Design a protein around this ligand. Structure first.
Ligand code: PRO
Ligand code: MG
Ligand code: MG
Ligand code: MG
Ligand code: MG
Ligand code: MG
Ligand code: MG
Ligand code: MG
Ligand code: MG
Ligand code: MG
Ligand code: MG
Ligand code: MG
Ligand code: MG
Ligand code: MG
Ligand code: MG
Ligand code: MG
Ligand code: MG
Ligand code: MG
Ligand code: MG
Ligand code: MG
Ligand code: MG
Ligand code: MG
Ligand code: MG
Ligand code: MG
Ligand code: MG
Ligand code: MG
Ligand code: MG
Ligand code: MG
Ligand code: MG
Ligand code: MG
Ligand code: MG
Ligand code: MG
Ligand code: MG
Ligand code: MG
Ligand code: MG
Ligand code: MG
Ligand code: MG
Ligand code: MG
Ligand code: MG
Ligand code: MG
Ligand code: MG
Ligand code: MG
Ligand code: MG
Ligand code: MG
Ligand code: MG
Ligand code: MG
Ligand code: MG
Ligand code: MG
Ligand code: MG
Ligand code: MG
Ligand code: MG
Ligand code: MG
Ligand code: MG
Ligand code: MG
Ligand code: MG
Ligand code: MG
Ligand code: MG
Ligand code: MG
Ligand code: MG
Ligand code: MG
Ligand code: MG
Ligand code: MG
Ligand code: MG
Ligand code: MG
Ligand code: MG
Ligand code: MG
Ligand code: MG
Ligand code: MG
Ligand code: MG
Ligand code: MG
Ligand code: MG
Ligand code: MG
Ligand code: MG
Ligand code: MG
Ligand code: MG
Ligand code: MG
Ligand code: MG
Ligand code: MG
Ligand code: MG
Ligand code: MG
Ligand code: MG
Ligand code: MG
Ligand code: MG
Ligand code: MG
Ligand code: MG
Ligand code: MG
Ligand code: MG
Ligand code: MG
Ligand code: MG
Ligand code: MG
Ligand code: MG
Ligand code: MG
Ligand code: MG
Ligand code: MG
Ligand code: MG
Ligand code: MG
Ligand code: MG
Ligand code: MG
Ligand code: MG
Ligand code: MG
Ligand code: MG
Ligand code: MG
Ligand code: MG
Ligand code: MG
Ligand code: MG
Ligand code: MG
Ligand code: MG
Ligand code: MG
Ligand code: MG
Ligand code: MG
Ligand code: MG
Ligand code: MG
Ligand code: MG
Ligand code: MG
Ligand code: MG
Ligand code: MG
Lengths: 98, 170, 136
RNA sequence: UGUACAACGGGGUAUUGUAAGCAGUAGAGUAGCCUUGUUGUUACGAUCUGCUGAGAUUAAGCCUUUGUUGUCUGAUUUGU
RNA sequence: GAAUGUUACCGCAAUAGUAAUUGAACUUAGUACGAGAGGAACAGUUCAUUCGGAUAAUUGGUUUUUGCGGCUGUCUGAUCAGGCAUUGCCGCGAAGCUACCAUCCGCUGGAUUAUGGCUGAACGCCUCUAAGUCAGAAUCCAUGCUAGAACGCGGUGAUUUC
RNA sequence: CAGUCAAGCGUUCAUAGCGACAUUGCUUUUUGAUUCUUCGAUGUCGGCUCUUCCUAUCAUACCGAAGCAGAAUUCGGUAAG
RNA sequence: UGAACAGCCUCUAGUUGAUAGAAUAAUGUAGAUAAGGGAAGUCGGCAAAAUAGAUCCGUAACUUCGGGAUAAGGAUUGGCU
RNA sequence: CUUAGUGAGGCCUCAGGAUCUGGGAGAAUUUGGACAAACUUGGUCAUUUAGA
RNA sequence: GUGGCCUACCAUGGUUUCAACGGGUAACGGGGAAUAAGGGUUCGAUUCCGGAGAGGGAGCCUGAGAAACGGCUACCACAUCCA
RNA sequence: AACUGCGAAUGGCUCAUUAAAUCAGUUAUCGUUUAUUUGAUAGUUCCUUUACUACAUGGUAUAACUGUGGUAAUUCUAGAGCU
């Protein structure tokens, strides 16, 4: 069970919903409802039709908290040395100086 | 599906096989680079935070960070790109690619550990595996060791033993 | 359906009444298929027999190589455009009415099928599984 | 005379697809006064943007309500 | 819908109407049969046709929701918001209605027919028949379904005082 | 449209399937013959629609027969659900 | 507005005369729209649908050389500056 | 050959910014172009050709 | 890189009976070949030179150099393997 | 093994297009690009210009490799750890 989305508007297409359009070039278009789907056949350009996902995304609308910082980073610092040359004698001689 | 988890602090790796929809479904609609908390996936992994790194669907096609889409798309790839190794000078090829968005169409989700859980995982935090090759360029030795352009390298290089049987060589 | 069709066929919206013209979609010579009967059709005073996906019909060719014109022959609707609906809730429709010419056994006359093909048609005539590019 | 009923008002749900107003270094461009401009200034210009997925409509056979206001004995008949 | 006290509720069932149809793929089985060529069927499964009764979650249709938006001509000085063009024109458009264009559902017992038989005389033999009797059909009667006799019926509640 | 006799057809074998000469019937969607009813008027082909009925059954149910090996067919019974 | 005494809207002038009220069943009359197919309907495309202005480009058979010809087939069209 | 219509794809360009470093790199993505295959429909030229 | 190569603005030019333009070519061009009075006629896909193509078109990456095909990319026509 | 460099634009094959095109003989670059081969060709690079700038030589990121994987299937390749 997959929710699909509207290849014109961008809205989730819950099971058994709307209309699916297999075009001549074999590219499929799923429309949630006949509004997008006719707006589609009318050769309308979704980046011009306000209420769509694509129009918004492109017009920087409402996003606010995705352009907000997060907090994901670690701190490692562990040692393995080199395979074939005693991993013991590579932290004693690794006592460094400056 | 299968999880290919890497432990990159220890350089350890191991797979795990997870049936049960709700257990998996924690990865769904997550993208490459999104971190996942671990108790959702199991109770061994309780705590462990996984950043999602790559992985292949059935039929074997690879993922590709930066595509979006939970589908496959056929792309033009070049030198200096993932899932493409060019056979010839300035050779581009048009190849299928799977999206960075996990779905249940995957056989293997590639995961990199970022934070350890309250419990050890056996083939990952129990076992530690060495870095194969050590510093070779001049200054790099001086930085793996911290030596000042004084201490003279020569003797700070690594020396890998191996035996002729009765002759053990350096 | 009928002769040499391994499989059944769950009912699908009938979009092709006798006299419809579907594009010829194989490399046979034909430009179009003009449906004159439907195999396995029903009988009811004044209904037209009507084809859908992966039915076998009987058409003549209106446009095509003269050696293919003015004669009756089997054909198989491979693309619908009158939207039908599957047992998974989806109402899907192609962009054209189109089928490929065949024999009673259900073997094609060209060596390919240009354009897509619905699955229900392909799940039904093996030789169409052969020649199909992108199914559904 | 009450988990009363109604008129509104509120909340949901749904339709359309961004209201009026005001603002703007958006705008092919255009006028006018000189203090003729090292953005000169005052306005005007289809359209564009922002406040604004806003505004408008949403039971008339949608849902719902602690709110507001109101309503709660007119008429006729019936017997083994 | 008057009248069999009034009114109400729950029921009974006379009589009557009645409904389901046909095909295929798998499988059986390349099987029995056949020198071969050829080549079935019963049980099982999956779908279909014709028909019928519903139904509106979905998909489609419909649009005076004159709901939103758009466009022409004009009239209100402009602005705002609007009037007229027998519903001006266009896209979208809920609700309702609605479509094998959409979805769901369409029951199982008995009795028999032809026909094959049992036992068995007539007629020391023989005979499915004479007496008696088994099996039997898209038939018939039921079960089921729709009415409910407005002069067929039952159970039950309450039954008026100025 | 259906019978009776059965000379013949059917390799053989009258009647599996047919059947001459003859002869017996039935039916009333043929066509005739008749002119009883209607000429102070029964609207007059075909189709569309839609209902119902008949059976001399094309299909579907279950059968008997075969010149039925099988598959196909054929003759026949109960049958108009 | 527009080619216009066309259609549509308006000033002047003149009307607001045509039983009424409540609903919005079947069937109608009049005005409409329908997925896919596209005359398979039917005596017959009956009806209905489609076309349509202008600027431009392009334009066949045949001809009484006058035509056939808006033949056919195309593109274009607001606003504002 | 070619009108008209539709138009792949790389290229140029307005944008984009998964990430990944020091204003820069940079994928999916996308605007506008030139180039332009190709499909549909017609026309045209050449060369063939069935036929009572 | 010269250049209507292309774009803008501008003029109205350019070729032709001394045959333009168009059609044909079972036409790649040349070195050459066959035929021996001479003049000629006929021929050259084909070992050397130039050119064009890599199934038909276009597009391009890399590069000193390709519009390359025993390189990519798109479409058209072919056509292969499969779970 | 792999990286890096160079080569894969030569060769070989065919004659389909091609009729002022190609090709030929003859010119032109005062009209431009050129790997290579050959010969030449380089004291200048920092900075308010004494408390100086790694020159005794400044940076990381990768292949191969290890190890974990995916697909019926290709000279497919992903995640991780090195140099
Ligand atoms: O009916 C019929 C007759 C024939 C002649 C006129 N009417
Ligand atoms: Mg709708
Ligand atoms: Mg619609
Ligand atoms: Mg009819
Ligand atoms: Mg459809
Ligand atoms: Mg094949
Ligand atoms: Mg395939
Ligand atoms: Mg009130
Ligand atoms: Mg807005
Ligand atoms: Mg506003
Ligand atoms: Mg304001
Ligand atoms: Mg009502
Ligand atoms: Mg309130
Ligand atoms: Mg009394
Ligand atoms: Mg029936
Ligand atoms: Mg078999
Ligand atoms: Mg066989
Ligand atoms: Mg035999
Ligand atoms: Mg129902
Ligand atoms: Mg119905
Ligand atoms: Mg609806
Ligand atoms: Mg409408
Ligand atoms: Mg309006
Ligand atoms: Mg206006
Ligand atoms: Mg204003
Ligand atoms: Mg008025
Ligand atoms: Mg009027
Ligand atoms: Mg009107
Ligand atoms: Mg409009
Ligand atoms: Mg209705
Ligand atoms: Mg159905
Ligand atoms: Mg039905
Ligand atoms: Mg059923
Ligand atoms: Mg029942
Ligand atoms: Mg029962
Ligand atoms: Mg009984
Ligand atoms: Mg018995
Ligand atoms: Mg016996
Ligand atoms: Mg006797
Ligand atoms: Mg008996
Ligand atoms: Mg008896
Ligand atoms: Mg007897
Ligand atoms: Mg029955
Ligand atoms: Mg009942
Ligand atoms: Mg009675
Ligand atoms: Mg009565
Ligand atoms: Mg009663
Ligand atoms: Mg009674
Ligand atoms: Mg009673
Ligand atoms: Mg009683
Ligand atoms: Mg006779
Ligand atoms: Mg005789
Ligand atoms: Mg005999
Ligand atoms: Mg005999
Ligand atoms: Mg004989
Ligand atoms: Mg006899
Ligand atoms: Mg008689
Ligand atoms: Mg009679
Ligand atoms: Mg008769
Ligand atoms: Mg008389
Ligand atoms: Mg008479
Ligand atoms: Mg009379
Ligand atoms: Mg009369
Ligand atoms: Mg009469
Ligand atoms: Mg009468
Ligand atoms: Mg009369
Ligand atoms: Mg015999
Ligand atoms: Mg036999
Ligand atoms: Mg047979
Ligand atoms: Mg019988
Ligand atoms: Mg009947
Ligand atoms: Mg009867
Ligand atoms: Mg006028
Ligand atoms: Mg009147
Ligand atoms: Mg009137
Ligand atoms: Mg009235
Ligand atoms: Mg009506
Ligand atoms: Mg229609
Ligand atoms: Mg249509
Ligand atoms: Mg048409
Ligand atoms: Mg026609
Ligand atoms: Mg007719
Ligand atoms: Mg007809
Ligand atoms: Mg007809
Ligand atoms: Mg006529
Ligand atoms: Mg006539
Ligand atoms: Mg017509
Ligand atoms: Mg008429
Ligand atoms: Mg007409
Ligand atoms: Mg229309
Ligand atoms: Mg004409
Ligand atoms: Mg036209
Ligand atoms: Mg314009
Ligand atoms: Mg394009
Ligand atoms: Mg440019
Ligand atoms: Mg793109
Ligand atoms: Mg000829
Ligand atoms: Mg001829
Ligand atoms: Mg130049
Ligand atoms: Mg001129
Ligand atoms: Mg001239
Ligand atoms: Mg001449
Ligand atoms: Mg040639
Ligand atoms: Mg020559
Ligand atoms: Mg030559
Ligand atoms: Mg040749
Ligand atoms: Mg040269
Ligand atoms: Mg070849
Ligand atoms: Mg090439
Ligand atoms: Mg080769
Ligand atoms: Mg080559
Ligand atoms: Mg071609
Ligand atoms: Mg598989
Ligand atoms: Mg190399
Ligand atoms: Mg060469
Ligand atoms: Mg780096």
């Amino acid at each position: 069970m997959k929710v699909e989305i509207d290849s014109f508007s961008g809205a989730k297409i819950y099971p058994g919903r709307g209309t699916l359009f297999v075009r001549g070039d074999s590219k499929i278009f799923r429309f949630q409802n006949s509004k997008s789907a006719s707006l589609f056949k009318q050769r309308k350009n979704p980046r011009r039709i306000a209420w769509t996902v694509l129009f918004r995304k492109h017009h920087k609308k409402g996003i606010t908290e995705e352009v907000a910082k997060k907090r994901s980073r670690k701190t490692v610092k562990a040692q393995r040395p080199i395979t074939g040359a005693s991993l013991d004698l590579i932290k004693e001689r690794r006592s460094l100086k400056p | 599906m299968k999880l290919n988890i890497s432990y990159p602090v220890n350089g350890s790796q191991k797979t795990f096989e997870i049936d049960d929809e709700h257990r998996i479904r924690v990865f769904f609609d997550k993208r490459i680079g999104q971190e996942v908390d671990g108790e959702a996936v199991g109770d061994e992994f309780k705590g462990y935070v996984f950043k999602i790194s790559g992985g292949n669907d059935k039929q074997g096609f690879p993922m590709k960070q930066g595509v979006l889409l939970p589908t496959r798309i056929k792309l033009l790839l070049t030198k200096n790109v993932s899932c493409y190794r060019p056979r010839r000078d300035g050779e581009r090829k048009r190849k299928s690619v799977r999206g960075a968005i996990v779905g249940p169409d995957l056989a293997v989700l590639a995961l990199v550990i970022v934070k350890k859980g309250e419990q050890e995982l056996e083939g990952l935090t129990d076992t530690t595996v060495p870095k194969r090759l050590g510093p070779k360029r001049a200054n790099n030795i001086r930085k793996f060791f911290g030596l000042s352009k004084e201490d003279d390298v020569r003797d700070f290089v690594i020396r890998r033993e191996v035996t002729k049987g009765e002759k053990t060589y350096t | 359906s009928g002769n040499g069709a391994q499989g059944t066929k769950f009912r699908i919206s009938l979009g092709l009444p006798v006299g419809a013209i579907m594009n010829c979609a194989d490399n046979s010579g034909a430009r179009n298929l003009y449906i004159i009967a439907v195999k396995g059709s029903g009988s009811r005073l004044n209904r037209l027999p009507a084809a859908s996906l992966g039915d076998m019909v009987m058409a003549t060719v209106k446009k095509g190589k003269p050696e293919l014109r003015k004669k009756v022959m089997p054909a198989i609707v491979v693309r619908q455009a009158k939207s039908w609906r599957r047992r998974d809730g989806v109402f899907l429709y192609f962009e054209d009415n189109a089928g490929v010419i065949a024999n009673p056994k259900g073997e094609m006359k060209g060596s390919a099928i240009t354009g897509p093909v619905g699955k229900e048609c392909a799940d039904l005539w093996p030789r169409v599984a052969s020649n199909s590019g992108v199914v559904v």
